[PDB]
């Protein structure tokens, strides 16, 4: 066919990051830790965003009110943030793709930007039409002693290597789906790979504190309550 897609029709599919708890209240969250140095990954709740370093483990937790159906699988796919880029597939760099896959005895070949750790049944699929890559795994019951489930993700490229992330921030969408292809719940988060995930998390927080000024509690109340004078030059 000469049309070779990318022309009039069919139009490329555009995934949406719209949250939808659904019946089982499917939610996503990332455990919090002190601002330690060389942190593999750190998350800020105020901004709903995660910073990670390449090849480091980022455990993520799913929270639901009642365990999903048996046979259900969890999906995770990377896509660009703005629509102008979400129609373009995210791929590997020329330098980092050239490296040998070393797939012998490995569950996650480098060919996929996102990989799973700690599940021998992790497998990857390719979108037949729009190229997108994604990885899937069977949902297991919540860990013993708590009500949530843990999945370990790994990234094989970093934001600033040309030909993959190419300085373009992206979003990751994680969904709970039934064996018959029906969606139960969808949640999404924003991801960045950087040299110091600890440093970027602190920086955005400092930007908010500067904008917000707190009133000292030395006095129970102001007698004059006058707003005279300049607040910010
Ligand atoms: Zn790369």
Q: How far is the CA of 28 from the centre of ligand 1 (A)?
A: 27
Tell me if 53 sits within 8 A of 198, measured CB to CB: no
Range of the domain at 16: 1-233
Q: How far is the CA of 224 from the centre of ligand 1 (A)?
A: 60
Which one, of 165, 167, 189, 179, lies nearest residue 61 by Cα?
Answer: 189
Q: How far is the CA of 152 from the centre of ligand 1 (A)?
A: 20
How many domains, the chain?
1
Q: How far apart are CA 159 and CA 168, in angstroms?
A: 7
Q: Which residues of 178-214 are buried (b: 16+ CB within 10 A; e: fewer)?
A: eeeeeebbbbbbebebbeebbebbeeeeeeeeeeeee
Q: How far is the CA of 67 from the centre of ligand 1 (A)?
A: 37
CA angle at residue 55 from 15 to 16, to 5 degrees? 10
Q: How far apart are CA 110 and CA 107, in angstroms?
A: 10
Q: How far is the CA of 93 from the centre of ligand 1 (A)?
A: 4
Edge to edge, the sheet with strand 170-177 lists 41-44, 49-52, 183-193, 170-177, 73-80, 133-138, 123-126
Other beta carbons within 10 Å of 27:
15
Q: Which residues contact 41 (CB under 8 A, 6 or more apart)?
A: 30, 50, 51, 52, 53, 56, 57, 58, 197
Look up the CATH number of the domain holding residue 78.
2.60.40.720
Q: How far apart are CA 171 and CA 164, in angstroms?
A: 14
The experimental technique used to determine this model is NMR
């Amino acid at each position: 066919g000469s049309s070779t897609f990318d022309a009039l029709s069919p139009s490329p599919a555009i995934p949406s990051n719209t949250d939808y708890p659904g019946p089982h209240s499917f939610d996503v969250s990332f455990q919090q830790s002190s601002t330690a140095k060389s942190a593999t990954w750190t998350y800020s709740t105020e901004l709903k965003k995660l910073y990670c370093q390449i090849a480091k483990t980022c455990p993520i937790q799913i929270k639901v009110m009642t365990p999903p159906p048996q046979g259900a699988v969890i999906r995770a796919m990377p896509v660009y943030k703005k629509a102008e880029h979400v129609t373009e597939v995210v791929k590997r760099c020329p330098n980092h793709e050239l490296s040998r896959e070393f797939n012998e005895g490995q569950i996650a070949p480098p060919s996929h930007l996102i990989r799973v750790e700690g599940n021998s049944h992790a497998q990857y699929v390719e979108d037949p039409i729009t190229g997108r890559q994604s990885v899937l795994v069977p949902y297991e019951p919540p860990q013993v002693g708590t009500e949530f489930t843990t999945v370990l993700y790994n990234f094989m490229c970093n934001s600033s290597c040309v030909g993959g992330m190419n300085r373009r921030p992206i979003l990751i969408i994680v969904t709970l789906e039934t064996r018959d292809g029906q969606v139960l719940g969808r949640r999404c988060f924003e991801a960045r790979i950087c040299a110091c995930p600890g440093r970027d998390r602190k920086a955005d927080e400092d930007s908010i504190r500067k904008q917000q000024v707190s009133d000292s509690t030395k006095n129970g109340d102001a007698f004059r309550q006058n707003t005279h004078g300049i607040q910010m030059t």
